[PDB]
Design a protein around this ligand. Structure first.
Ligand SMILES: *[C@@H]1O[C@H](CO[C@H]2O[C@@H](C)[C@@H](O)[C@@H](O)[C@@H]2O)[C@@H](O[C@H]2O[C@H](CO)[C@@H](O[C@@H]3O[C@H](CO[C@H]4O[C@H](CO)[C@@H](O)[C@H](O)[C@@H]4O[C@@H]4O[C@H](CO)[C@@H](O[C@@H]5O[C@H](CO)[C@H](O)[C@H](O)[C@H]5O)[C@H](O)[C@H]4NC(C)=O)[C@@H](O)[C@H](O)[C@@H]3O)[C@H](O)[C@H]2NC(C)=O)[C@H](O)[C@H]1NC(C)=O
Ligand SMILES: *[C@@H]1O[C@H](CO)[C@@H](O)[C@H](O)[C@H]1NC(C)=O
Lengths: 269, 99
């Protein structure tokens, strides 16, 4: 029901290193903000942004590093296997994590993809990997060569995850309750023949959920073509474009809705 | 499967000539992850820029952000240039001050 805060890890590995990418790397997120970073050319998991100042139990960051070094070995070996029985290059990705149940117990997630498409899944309550593709077998078989693997992956999801999540909900309450509204601007510029383009821009807001609505003489008139992107410091940036008749620009306004605003904010040219 | 990159350029704070700010080039929705990106000032590469961690979304496609400190002026032109397997030639995109 209520906003259910998720904790998720994003994992990847590649064979082609001609553009300077490391062979394996990962990031970790609490909802929409990044709290962790890690890559094989450095061997250590580090906190990001404000999390650098969170008060944690002394072994916290050391345990994140070890659980991740484990996953790195499974991924890199899976790549070399495929590179032996098949021709070509590969990219392997994983999405692992959880959410808290009413009794503070875990609700898990575990899916994998090869060269851009889902090809496998893992069930922690039973310890098994599934899927329906020739590669599913090549990889799943490799990972079953040692029984500890299945057990460790099961613990990471059903014990560790809910533990770290309840812990951040406690020590990082301040960061997690972040509700900052956007700074706004509305401007007009030349468009196609006989037209002007209006751009509604929103700067430095958090969380990312936001809603744009253009108004004409005070009435709803469309949402426009919109997009959003990261702003460099953890906050977000978004914009929406609407095409209107040259000379009628002054009739239009922009209105936005966001959690950090007591109510909708209306903006002028 | 391959996917061509979407490329977007914008500033962190509302822009003003003669005032310090930060320039962003957001590259997303691509696959494979191998890629090259550079920021330009009047046709010439700008040295020592920064780059976020390479991440990805629910549909598996990749994304990343390139950025640097800068002070806009009336006459200087800023742009972003990228190379990727899905592109027959380098793609250069100019900054639009209204974004
Ligand atoms: C809001 O968002 C709308 C939708 O979002 C997406 O839209 C798509 C299309 C992308 O733009 C995404 O990025 C958006 O997210 C948005 O869309 C609306 O606008 C687009 C863009 O105009 C519409 O579709 C476009 O159609 C183009 C048509 O291709 C020609 O033009 C391109 C240049 O723009 C060329 O790159 C392309 O090669 C082609 O060029 C022409 O080719 C002709 C044939 O070869 C050639 O003609 C011959 O010429 C010779 C002489 O040389 C002879 O004369 C001969 O007889 C001729 O036949 C021409 O010379 C040549 N022209 C040039 C200049 O070289 C696509 O290329 C575009 O990629 C794009 O698809 C889109 O359809 C429309 N939306 C809808 C729903 O219809 C909308 O604009 C946004 N609104 C706002 C306010 O922002
Ligand atoms: C779950 O955690 C909350 C917050 O500490 C606590 O009040 C509650 O007793 C715990 N267990 C259950 C079943 O709610």
């Amino acid at each position: 029901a209520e906003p259910r805060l998720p904790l998720m890890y994003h994992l990847a590995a590649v064979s082609d290193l001609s553009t300077g990418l490391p062979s394996f790397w990962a990031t970790g997120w609490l909802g929409a903000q990044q709290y962790l970073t890690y890559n094989n050319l450095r061997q250590e998991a580090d906190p990001c942004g404000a999390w650098i100042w969170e008060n944690q139990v002394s072994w916290y960051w050391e345990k994140e590093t070890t659980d991740l070094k484990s996953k790195e070995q499974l991924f890199l070996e899976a790549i070399r296997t495929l590179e032996n029985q098949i021709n070509g290059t590969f990219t392997l990705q994983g999405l692992l994590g959880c959410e808290l149940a009413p009794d503070n117990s875990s609700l898990p997630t575990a899916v994998f993809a090869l060269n851009g498409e889902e090809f496998m899944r893992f069930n922690p309550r039973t310890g098994n990997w599934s899927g329906e593709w020739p590669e599913t077998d090549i990889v799943g078989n490799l990972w079953m060569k040692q029984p500890e693997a299945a057990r460790k992956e099961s613990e990471f999801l059903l014990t560790s995850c809910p533990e770290r999540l309840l812990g951040h909900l406690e020590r990082g309450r301040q960061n997690l309750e972040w509700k900052e509204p956007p700074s706004m601007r509305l401007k007009a510029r030349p468009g196609n023949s006989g037209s002007s383009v209006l751009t509604c821009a929103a700067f430095s807001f958090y969380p990312p959920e936001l809603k744009f609505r253009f108004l004409r003489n005070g009435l709803a008139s469309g949402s426009g073509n919109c997009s959003t992107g990261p702003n460099g410091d953890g906050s977000f940036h978004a914009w929406s474009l609407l095409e209107v008749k040259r000379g009628d620009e002054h009739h239009y306004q922009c209105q936005v809705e966001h959690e950090g605003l007591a109510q909708p904010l209306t903006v002028d040219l | 499967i391959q996917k061509t990159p979407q490329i977007q350029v914008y500033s962190r704070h509302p822009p003003e000539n003669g005032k310090p700010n930060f320039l962003n080039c957001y590259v997303s929705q691509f696959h494979p992850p191998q890629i090259e990106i550079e920021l330009l000032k009047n046709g010439k590469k700008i040295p020592n820029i920064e780059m976020s961690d390479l991440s990805f979304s629910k549909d598996w496609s990749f994304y990343i952000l390139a950025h640097t400190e800068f002070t806009p002026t009336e006459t200087d032109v800023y742009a972003c240039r990228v190379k990727h397997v899905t592109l027959k030639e380098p793609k250069t995109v100019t900054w639009d001050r209204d974004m």
